[model samples]
Target chain A: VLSPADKTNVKAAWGKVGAHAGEYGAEALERMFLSFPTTKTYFPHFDLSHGSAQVKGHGKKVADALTNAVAHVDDMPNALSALSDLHAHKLRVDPVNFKLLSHCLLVTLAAHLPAEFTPAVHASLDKFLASVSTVLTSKY
Target chain B: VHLTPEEKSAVTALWGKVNVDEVGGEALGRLLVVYPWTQRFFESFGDLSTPDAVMGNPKVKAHGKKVLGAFSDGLAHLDNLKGTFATLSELHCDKLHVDPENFRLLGNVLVCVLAHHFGKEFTPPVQAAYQKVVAGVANALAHKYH
Candidate 1:
């Protein structure tokens, strides 16, 4: 659970970063592909490289989803569990791939929110991402 | 865009009175009545020539809940409304292919319904606050896709 102070920081910091949400989400996916290598194989057709429309649009969706999740953290189960099923059953994405994405997202967020991403804030975001990661991989 | 704590409560409290069932059916009903072209999105709406048939349908009722629930959800995340609104924007822009102009139309109709829902409390700053929310949501849904 995010402390009231942590929520404040998260909200304020995002007010700045939310406008660039697509870029931030893209950074995470880029980092994921960089580290895991096999993840890029999922989208064999489109260009997932930096600044490509596919990368930006796909990243934007990812960032947008996470932002919605963060806003309604209490209802995480209902909000994201269905998505987990889609990824696991329909897309057949591996749970390990999700873990990598979460980690990269953290790096991206920290880079974007240098000052506001304090240790305490990091803990709050990390806690939520951990819960999201759990949900994303649970179906797997 | 900081709001007084009371303003936030006042705005959010008004929404608590909104019954999604009615909101969904009636609001979408308004859209179909106002712009019959939107019928392309809800083919199941059947006889769009008459709103009664459209609003009375179960499928329409379900979509009503979905739409109003999203509006109410966006209201709560005022602090990060950009993010909340972005999700709705992406959905409308990417898949549903709802025209940006339609969001403005949706906002106008929803605000009218919301005012009715809130009754007397929907006054002055309260009205202004919601206008801000709805307008921002409409703008977010419309931006960058042209």
Candidate 2:
């Protein structure tokens, strides 16, 4: 659903984000915990609060998964089927949490790539997250 | 799971040389030979445990390559070890019911191959780093299973 330029912008922008994903990952995850406290119920082991190893560590994973999911942007659902099933069936992660996570990540993206994260990129990334939200929650 | 800059550079440089997919295939070939239980999951690999036969089969080769490549990709980003292995563990443990022991054995398979491939480059530090990476992955996969 993205235009030619939109795809290019998103790819390039995300490439930068992925490079230092560990750093930005913490921010997005922190924002998630702050905005959606209920999502923390699934992660009983880790300190879901900000700056803990659990958050930072899990943050890296969230970023990595995003990086991976973006790679399969052409077919979001099929690519994320296993992950979706894991969250929905096993982990029992509420599907609504994905939208919150995506929203947090968008804020982090704009903060990281303020100069380049343009309106086109915003629209493209928004569409991209919407698709991600859809696919991740599809199992539910 | 953070790798030292030296370790990261060395590991990445060495991994860049060999064919990731080929290494993957070879590793799975060894997996079939070294670990019997893993064979049950790959019905296409046939009953025989011959590395040559497994390597020769395109289906096995494809499966092997994907497995190795995916792990190798995770190792490339040491910081994301927790998440990367979690993903693999979820698939293998939860879905495939793969044994935790097999995860450890597969790591050994990878180490054995890499150790042989890069003679001097696979130094003490390198081996140590690789072991830690493998252990991190295995632990992540094993955590829920055990």
Candidate 3:
């Protein structure tokens, strides 16, 4: 659902968020767990405490996945194939959790990069997250 | 998502002529192939590694039938969509925790299927009418999410 302008906005905004993708990912996860306690059920194996190593590690994975998605914006179906399989079958994470995590991710970016998170950028990012969420939860 | 009588007529007229299983199977198969993540929900089915495998799977075919059947039900209860879908809403939102967006996604796929199969019969007006019908179904199914 992203247009040409949206792709530019997403790429530009992500450029600014560059080095701290992992940190933002962790912050998003933390916010999700704290705001939506029900989501913690999926991460029984994770250390739920704020800034835990496990959280950071998992957040890195999350960040990497999103970064990869950015590179393959037009081919997410193939790019996210393995992850889709894992979440849909192995992990069986509830689809609603994607939306919760997405919301938190947006909040993290807005708080950390207020200047870069302009209205257009925010809209583009929201659509980007929703598209990714759609792919993630498609199997469900 | 109000549908005029003409729109309603267009939808029902086409519904009567549809080969539900074939259309549904094609729609579901394309959805899985186009968005591989969606195939995760069908892990129990055999061999989904290739597009051919996904299209040929018996379980996928059977499930496609059921999916279309739900639309048939929705078609029958157009005026009472929310009530018709109340139990389904609970099952997806409460029990399954499915994202409401999936409903819309599938609806779009279904439209594509109609266009692919019906070609000339699926005119612009009919497509517009069917969009409303599908949107109504999506909204009804998503009621419990609120």
- The most accurate candidate by lDDT is 3
**What TM value does model 2 have?**
0.47
Ranking by lDDT: 3, 2, 1
List the DockQ of the predictions in order.
Answer: 0.01, 0.01, 0.19
Q: Give per-residue CA lDDT, model 2, range B81-124, as digits (tens).
A: 66666666667655664446567788889889888788887898
- What DockQ number belongs to candidate 1? 0.01
Give the alpha carbon lDDT tens digit for every residue of A5-69 in model 1: 76676677677786898789888888987775656656779786777888888888998888887
Off by over 4 Å in 1: A1-140, B143-146
Q: lDDT per residue, candidate 3, A24-69, as tens digits?
A: 9998999998877657767778889976999999898999999999
Give all TM-scores, in the order shown.
0.47, 0.47, 0.68
Best candidate per DockQ, number? 3
What DockQ results for candidate 2?
0.01
Question: Among all windows of ten consecutive residues in candidate 1 chain A, which has the lowest summed lDDT?
Answer: A88-97
Per residue, candidate 1 scores C-alpha lDDT tens digits across B1-146 of: 35678778777878777776788678877876665555656666566557677877777777878888777777776677667767666666655545566677777788777777777878878877777777766776655354
Each candidate's chain B TM-score? 0.83, 0.85, 0.94
**TM-score, predicted candidate 1 vs. hidden true structure:** 0.47
Q: What is the model-wide C-alpha lDDT for candidate 1?
A: 0.73
Residue B50 lDDT (model 3) = 92
